[PDB]
Every structure is written in C-alpha cells, then in structure tokens.
UniProtKB/Swiss-Prot annotation, chain A:
The record marks 232 as: Important for species-specific agonist sensitivity. Changing residue 150 to A: No effect on agonist binding. Its main location: membrane. This is 5-hydroxytryptamine receptor 1B. A motif (DRY motif) lies at residues 102-104. It comes from the Eukaryota. Changing residue 210 to A: Abolishes agonist binding. It comes from Homo sapiens.
Swiss-Prot record, chain B:
Guanine nucleotide-binding proteins (G proteins) are involved as a modulator or transducer in various transmembrane signaling systems. The beta and gamma chains are required for the GTPase activity, for replacement of GDP by GTP, and for G protein-effector interaction. Expressed in fetal tissues, including testis, adrenal gland, brain, white blood cells and brain. The gene is GNG2. It comes from the Eukaryota. GO terms for cellular component: extracellular exosome; heterotrimeric G-protein complex; membrane; plasma membrane; synapse. This is Guanine nucleotide-binding protein G(I)/G(S)/G(O) subunit gamma-2. It comes from Homo sapiens (Human). Keywords: Acetylation, Cell membrane, Host-virus interaction, Lipoprotein, Membrane, Methylation, Prenylation, Transducer.
UniProtKB/Swiss-Prot annotation, chain D:
SUPFAM superfamilies: WD40 repeat-like. Changing residue 92 to S: In MRD42; decreases receptor-driven G protein activation; decreases trimer formation with alpha and gamma subunit; no effect on protein abundance;no effect on complex formation with gamma subunit. SMART domains: WD40. It holds the Pfam family WD40_Gbeta. Gene3D superfamilies: YVTN repeat-like/Quinoprotein amine dehydrogenase. This is Guanine nucleotide-binding protein G(I)/G(S)/G(T) subunit beta-1. Changing residue 90 to T: In MRD42; decreases receptor-driven G protein activation; increases trimer formation with alpha and gamma subunits; no effect on protein abundance; no effect on complex formation with gamma subunit. One of its GO terms (cellular component) is extracellular vesicle. It comes from the Eukaryota. It is linked to Intellectual developmental disorder, autosomal dominant 42: A disorder characterized by significantly below average general intellectual functioning associated with impairments in adaptive behavior and manifested during the developmental period. MRD42 patients manifest global developmental delay commonly accompanied by hypotonia, seizures of various types, ophthalmological manifestations, and poor growth. It comes from Homo sapiens. Keywords: Acetylation, Disease variant, Host-virus interaction, Intellectual disability, Phosphoprotein, Repeat, Transducer, WD repeat.
Length: 262, 56, 209, 333
C-alpha cells in the first residue's frame, strides 16, 4: 500500500542521508585536522570516500527502484547504476581487507613495516582496489526493469568470489593472525575482553551485512525478490556502519570529531 | 659561606632601597601620553589601509 | 625583477627539498630519554650500546637509535623535559647497590611517570649493578625500605614491584630488566622493549589491546 | 650574624614595600577608566609559514621587519621572508634542541641555543662564527645588543653579557634564585630585564653590571618578559595565568591582566608599536590581545592547534607572528 511506501521512502532516504552525513564528516575531519595526515588514516578516509560514492551514485537511485519496482531513467543510466553499484560495494569490500592488510603488517612486522608505510604506498593500495573494482564491472557490457545481467555463469562465479569470498577468506585469515598476535601481546583480562569485542565488531559487521547478499548470488545463478531488496540495503547499511567502527577504535579521530563539532 | 649570601643580599637590598621612586598617577600618565601620541602611528591599533599594508 | 623573485623561490626549492629529506630521516629514528640518579651507570650503558645534554647515535638490529642523557643541570626539571615530549620510550636507570639512590631515584621516577607530557609515553626500567647488589644484600639486607625474606630473587623483585607500583597509568607498560654491572648485551632488551612499545601503539591505534 | 642580617634585610624589604604603597595614590585602572577602549579588533591571518617538522620553540623579527628567524626542535633554524612567504636561509643546528633564537639589529648575525649550554652564532654559505660556551645550564633566552655584543640568560641562575669578536663573558649578572627563563632589552639598550622561575623580574644595567631593582608580582614561575616601547615599563607572562605590567620609575606592579577561564600559563608576550595593545601567547592554543590601559581583552587570536611558544611583534609594528608547537608561524595583520 501507499502508506507503507511512504514509511519505506522515508526510511531509505534517511539511511541514504545518514550514510552521506557519516562519510562527509569523516573525510572532512582527516583533511581539516593536521595530526590525522598519516598513511593509516588515509585508508580509513578512502573507505569513507567509497562509502560516500555508494550514498551518492547508488543510494538515491536505489530508493526509487525498491518503492516502484519498475525502471524510469533510460537504458543508459541503468548501465551506469549497476556497474557503479558493483564497483562501489566491491571497493568498499576491498577497502576493509586492505586496511586489514595494512594492520596485519603493522602488528606482525611492526618495526619493519613502520619504515615502509608512506603516503605513496598508501595511495598505491587505494589505486589497486579501484583498478580491481572497475575491472569486475567491465565484463557485464554484452547488452522493462533494470535487473543485473546474468549470462555467463562463469563471470558470475568469477565476480562474486573475487569481489567478496576472497576478501572474506583474506580478512578472516588476517584478523585470525592479528588476534593471536594481540593476545600474545596482552598476556589485563579486561583488555582481552575489548580485543574480542573489537575483533567481533570489525569482522562481524562485514560478514553479517554482506554474506546474505553474496549467498543469494549462488542461490540465484529459489525465492522471490522481496528478500533481495532487503539484502541490498543491508549491504548499503554496512557503508554507514563501516566509518563509525573504524573511527571508534581510533582515539585521535574520536577526540578530533568531538573537538570539531562541539 | 652562609653569611656571604646574606651580606650580598643585604648589600643588594641596601642599593635597591635607596632610589628615587615616584607616584603611580605620574607614571601612568606618561604611559597613557605615549600611547595617545603614537595612536595614529600604530598599524595594529587602528587597522591599516590595503594599499599601504604589504601583506594585503 | 621577476627573475630575482624566481631566484629567491629557487633558493626555497632547495631548502624545501633539504628539509623534507632530513625530516623523514629524523622521523623514522627512535628517540630515547635516558633519565636516572647520579652514579647509576647512565654513561656506562651508552658506552656499552655504542656539559648539558649528551647525544648518542648507535644502531642495532636494522634500526637507528638516539639515547639522550640529561645531566649536570640541577635546575627546574619542568623546563628541559617538555623539550622532548615525543620520545618513544623513557630509559630509566637505577643504582641497585645504593640506598640513597633507591629512595631518591624512586621519587624522581614517580614525578616523571606522573608528568603530564610523559603519561602518554612508555618506560624502560633498568635496575643496574645487579652483580654488586647480590653481594650487598647478604651483608646489609633490604630491611630499611619497609619490609619479605633477604634473597637476591626476592629483594630485587620488591624493588621492581615498588617501581611498578608507581605507575597509575593505563596504556603505559613499564619494561624491567637487571643488568650485571655493565657487561651484558642489554641493547637487545631496549630493542625488545621498543618492539613491544611500537606494536602496543599499533594495537592501541587499531582498537585491540 | 645570620639572624641580624636577615632582620636587616627584612626591614629593607618592609621599607621598600612601604615606599611603593606611599607612591601609589591612584591606580592605572582608575585613571584610564575615562579613556575609550580599543573595542572588538582582531587581526586577520595574513600568512601561514609551512616548513617546520617538530615544535617551534622560538622566533624573532629583524630590524627591517622583513625577515623573521624561527628555531625548532627539528634541528633546523629557518630565516623566513614575511612578504614573500618564502625560505631565505635554513641553518642546520649542531644540537637538535633549541629553546631560544635571536636575529641581530644590523641583519648579519643569527644566534641560537638550548640544552647545549652554548649560544651558537651564525654569520649570514653559513657556518659557526663564535660558539659562546660558558654556562652551567641550558640557554633559556638571548638577544643581540649590537653586532659585537650579545646578552644571554640561562638555567644556571645567572645571565651573562658576551663579546662575539673575543668569544668570552664581559660581565656576569648574578641575582636570581631559580632558573632564568626570558629577558628583554630596552630600546636604548642601556638597561634590560629578566623573569625567572622564582617569580621575580630584575632590572639590570648593561655597562655597570648590577641589579638595579627587583619586581615581585607573580606567584608562579615567570616564563616570558617584554619591554614597553618607551623604556620605562614592561609586561611579564607567568605560569599563574596572569600577565602583569610593571613601572621602572614607580618600581611596582601597575596592572594585572587576567581571566578565570584562562587557566594555563603564558608562554610569550609582546607590545605593539604604540604599546596600547599587549599581546600574550597562552598554553591553550590561543593568543589574547589585551589592552594595556583598560585591563580587558580587545580581541583574541586562534589559528594554532597546539600551544603557542613564541610571540614576536615587528619593530615598526606592522604585523605579529605567533610560533607554535603545531610547527607553524601564522603572521597577523
Ligand atoms: N529474483 C532474483 C534475483 C535477481 C537478480 C539476482 N542477482 C544478484 C546476483 N547476481 C550477480 O550478478 C552478482 O552481482 C554482484 C557481484 C559482485 C558485486 N560486488 C558488489 C556488488 C553490489 C551488490 N549490492 C556486486 C553484485 C545475479 C543477479 C539475484 C536474484
């Protein structure tokens, strides 16, 4: 009905604005604050930039798609929206495992990697993700509603594993090794409690949000598309959850954030 | 050793005591007269013009 | 004279390149404050690893180190300490074979541990003259400093415990060690302490620890 | 003998305190109540000199009011150009630490020192001309009298005049109890002052080499000090979070500039060309612009993130340049 649609339009527009609001402040805080100009923080900044592009490119077009269930912006914009949706949520996915790879070397190597960490080597990692992201969206260009184009199942299985399950296997393997390095450093028991809660929120927020959607990829290479539309916005719900996790852990930014806006 | 510090302090205090001290009203008038004299000359007190200002 | 202004800008291009190359070199190096009481073996550890301030420039295990031993100042301690608030770790030397040292140094340790600038800075406690201490406790024990039994393991541990007691600061691990007079490779202990400090900062920044 | 000397010294101090109170008929705040204030005037940020790695600990303008020198904990002493916002020189220091800096009135020599206990002079290639080594403690402040002469304070409890050509102490100024932090030369360069850790400024004589008179207004340690343009008064920043004006003629504390919100101490102070505005750099990342007569903050400067260390107004009074631990020199106008 229409009144349920008004609540849905109000909900998703609020989420779209909340993602834009969270990401816009995080990018502004790194650039404005002089102390935060470091190779570690630029990865968190670029994670906010990717999630910002989800909230600008994908989000406001996705709100109209869910409520109507029928395309109304030409076939050209349809081509740009899906590919951008993939790249942005593949860049947002790959940014977390890149921050994980940045942290992994920062914990296990530490003294060696301290010298290697530079704003250029930081910028190289962001370039590789964007080059990887666009190259996952480049293959589907073989062409009423603007659905995703399934034709080569070999490309579907190639896309999903490269743009989720390989990051998933990487991220759990990295944070598995970081948590062992963390506990060995700890052993006091109260810190160990935080170590578990910190590792759980970083890893769990990534899995709980995205695992439902990329499972649906393999299920529909079964059930109707109501659940699909839920898991897309569950995945876009990660984009606003990502900055608030990665900023909450950092004491310098969380201090800088309150200092900026009272 | 201890007497030398007291003697040096007493000699310094004796020299510092014998001085021509004047009133606060007389001294403050000199400081106020100086500030009023250089009031137009000061760039910071009354903000300077953009042409004459080198930074602008 | 636009060329004259360009020549002045050309001088600054050389200065900007010089500062950037020197700055990144000074940034990667580990800066260490060497504090402690007099006659505690402050210069001995610097000599073993390798007149106001005394600089050191030794390197060990693929990393540059910079020990800084303040001494002969006897002035307001609050002034020269804030000059280097950004040290990686405060090396603190303690004379074990000495009781004036034991109470006087422990008070100085407390103040530096409690100093507004150094509460966000780790400490590497060195309990020097351990060989001389072991022989000294047999003749005259550690009964003067309140209490426990008179033994090398117990007496040295209670000293370490008392320095560890005056911590009062989360995110500030005190790394203790007992050198035999001044004839042991204790530069690796500084590396081992600093390695733990850098990882602890990386964890603390990450969210863990 | 010891008790008799202490009783005689206390009687002289009581006679001195009575003499100051007898002179004080009116106050500075009373006679300047009728005078109209400065008002809401705050200087805009003209420049932002970006080229320091570590915390800037001191800076000083030249005579021309064109070039400004700035010393920092990087082990780098940069001579800037205020107009062109450009590097003129960049002198690499012997010791990495530097708590003071000076620049000659002739515009030739450049002085610096700190935890070395040496006032290293540099002639404008650049190299060491005369390393003035003869202090027991850290060099706290130093200022050029002329091209030949130079005066220095230290943590050894004693200031000392030097000769650059000879390379030796001409006369030693002894008097303070705690470590001396700052000094300030008069316009005439015949007398000077110096605040110390024992909460007491002391007026010295350059030619004579003796303490003329002591000033005791502050509670906590005096960090900074600066002369009034005419040369018959001076202001002093302290750890007590209160700037205090003093008169050399009256020999007493004229006026105290303070605020309840301002809790942290003062790092550096300086007057304008006229001496109406008294600027003061605080430890809470700000620099309030006080009125010297009205006893109220006209404006406030807040460019820096970390605490301001040094404060330097130009000779002609065109601009101010506040250095800071953020590693920036923001020029005001
Ligand atoms: N009924 C139904 C139904 C309709 C379409 C789909 N698809 C979703 C899974 N399919 C894919 O092509 C995989 O899509 C990807 C593959 C990698 C990706 N990386 C990021 C995203 C953005 C998703 N929000 C993304 C999306 C086939 C179309 C599933 C069920």
């Amino acid at each position: 009905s229409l009144p349920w649609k008004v609540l849905l339009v109000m909900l998703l527009a609020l989420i779209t604005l909340a993602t834009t609001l969270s990401n816009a402040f995080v990018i502004a805080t790194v650039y404005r604050t002089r102390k935060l100009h470091t190779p570690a923080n630029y990865l968190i900044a670029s994670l906010a930039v990717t999630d910002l592009l989800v909230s600008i490119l994908v989000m406001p077009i996705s709100t109209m798609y869910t409520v109507t269930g029928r395309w109304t912006l030409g076939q050209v914009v349809c081509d740009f929206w899906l590919s951008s949706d993939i790249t942005c949520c593949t860049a947002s996915i790959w940014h977390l495992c890149v921050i994980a790879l940045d942290r992994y070397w920062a914990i296990t190597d530490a003294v060696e990697y301290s010298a290697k960490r530079t704003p250029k080597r930081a910028a190289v990692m962001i370039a590789l993700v964007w080059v990887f992201s666009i190259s996952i969206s480049l293959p589907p260009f073989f062409w009423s509603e603007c659905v995703v184009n399934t034709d080569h199942i070999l490309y579907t299985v190639y896309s999903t594993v490269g743009a989720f399950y390989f990051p998933t296997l990487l991220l759990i393997a990295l944070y598995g090794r970081i948590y062992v390095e963390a506990r060995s450093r700890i052993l006091m028991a109260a810190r160990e409690r935080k170590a578990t809660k910190t590792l759980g929120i970083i890893l769990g927020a990534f899995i709980v949000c995205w695992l439902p959607f990329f499972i649906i990829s393999l299920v529909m290479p079964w059930f109707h598309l109501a659940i699909f539309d839920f898991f897309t916005w569950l995945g876009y719900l990660n984009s606003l959850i990502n900055p608030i996790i990665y900023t909450m852990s950092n004491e310098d930014f969380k201090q800088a954030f309150h200092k900026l806006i009272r | 050793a201890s007497i030398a510090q007291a003697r040096k302090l007493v000699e310094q205090l004796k020299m510092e005591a014998n001085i021509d001290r004047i009133k606060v009203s007389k001294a403050a008038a000199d400081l106020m007269a100086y500030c009023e004299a250089h009031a137009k000359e000061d760039p910071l007190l009354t903000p300077v013009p953009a042409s004459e200002n080198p930074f602008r | 004279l636009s060329a004259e202004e360009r020549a002045a800008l050309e001088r600054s291009k050389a200065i900007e390149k010089n500062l950037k190359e020197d700055g990144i070199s000074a940034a990667k190096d580990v800066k260490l404050l060497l504090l402690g009481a007099d006659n505690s073996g402050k210069s001995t550890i610097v000599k073993q690893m390798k007149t106001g301030i005394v600089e050191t420039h030794f390197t060990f295990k693929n990393l540059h180190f910079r020990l800084f031993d303040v001494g002969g100042q006897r002035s307001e301690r609050k002034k020269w300490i804030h000059c280097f608030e950004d040290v990686t770790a405060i090396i603190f030397c303690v004379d074990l074979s000495d009781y004036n040292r034991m109470h006087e140094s422990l008070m100085l340790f407390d103040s530096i541990c409690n100093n507004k600038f150094f509460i966000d800075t780790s400490i590497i406690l060195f309990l020097n003259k351990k060989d001389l201490f072991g022989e000294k406790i047999k003749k005259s024990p550690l009964t003067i400093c309140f209490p426990g039994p008179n033994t090398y393991e117990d007496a040295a541990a209670y000293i370490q415990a008392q320095f560890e007691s005056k911590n009062r600061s989360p995110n500030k691990e005190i790394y203790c060690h007992m050198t035999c007079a001044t004839d042991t490779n204790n530069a690796q202990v500084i590396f081992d302490a600093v390695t733990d400090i850098i990882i602890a900062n990386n964890l603390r920044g990450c969210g863990l620890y | 003998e010891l008790d008799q000397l202490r009783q005689e010294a206390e009687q002289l101090k009581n006679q001195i305190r009575d003499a100051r109170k007898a002179c004080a008929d009116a106050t500075l705040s009373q006679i300047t109540n009728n005078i109209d204030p400065v008002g809401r005037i705050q200087m805009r940020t003209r420049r932002t000199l970006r080229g320091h790695l570590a915390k800037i600990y001191a800076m000083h303008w030249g005579t021309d009011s064109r070039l400004l020198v700035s010393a920092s904990q990087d082990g780098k002493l940069i001579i800037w150009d205020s107009y062109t916002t450009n590097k003129v020189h960049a002198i690499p220091l012997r010791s990495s630490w530097v708590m003071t800096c000076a620049y000659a009135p002739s515009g030739n020599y450049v002085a610096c020192g700190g935890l070395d206990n040496i006032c290293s002079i540099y002639n404008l290639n650049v190299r060491v001309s005369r390393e003035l080594a003869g202090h027991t403690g850290y060099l706290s402040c130093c200022r050029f009298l002329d091209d030949n002469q130079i005066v220095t304070s230290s943590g050894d409890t004693t200031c000392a005049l030097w000769d650059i050509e000879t390379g030796q102490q001409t006369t030693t100024f002894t008097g303070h109890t705690g470590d001396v932090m700052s000094l300030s030369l008069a316009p005439d360069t015949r007398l000077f002052v110096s605040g110390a850790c024992d909460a007491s400024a002391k007026l010295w004589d350059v030619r004579e080499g003796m303490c003329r008179q002591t000033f005791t207004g502050h509670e906590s340690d005096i960090n900074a000090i600066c002369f009034f343009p005419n040369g018959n008064a001076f202001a002093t920043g302290s750890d007590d979070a209160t700037c205090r004006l003093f008169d050399l003629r009256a020999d007493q504390e004229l006026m105290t500039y303070s605020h309840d919100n301002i809790i942290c101490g003062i790092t550096s102070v300086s007057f304008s060309k006229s001496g109406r505005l008294l600027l003061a750099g605080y430890d809470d990342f700000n620099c309030n612009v006080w009125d010297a007569l009205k006893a109220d903050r006209a404006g406030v400067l807040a460019g820096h993130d970390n605490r301001v260390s040094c404060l330097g107004v130009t000779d002609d009074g065109m601009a101010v340049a506040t250095g800071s631990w953020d590693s920036f020199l923001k020029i005001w106008n």
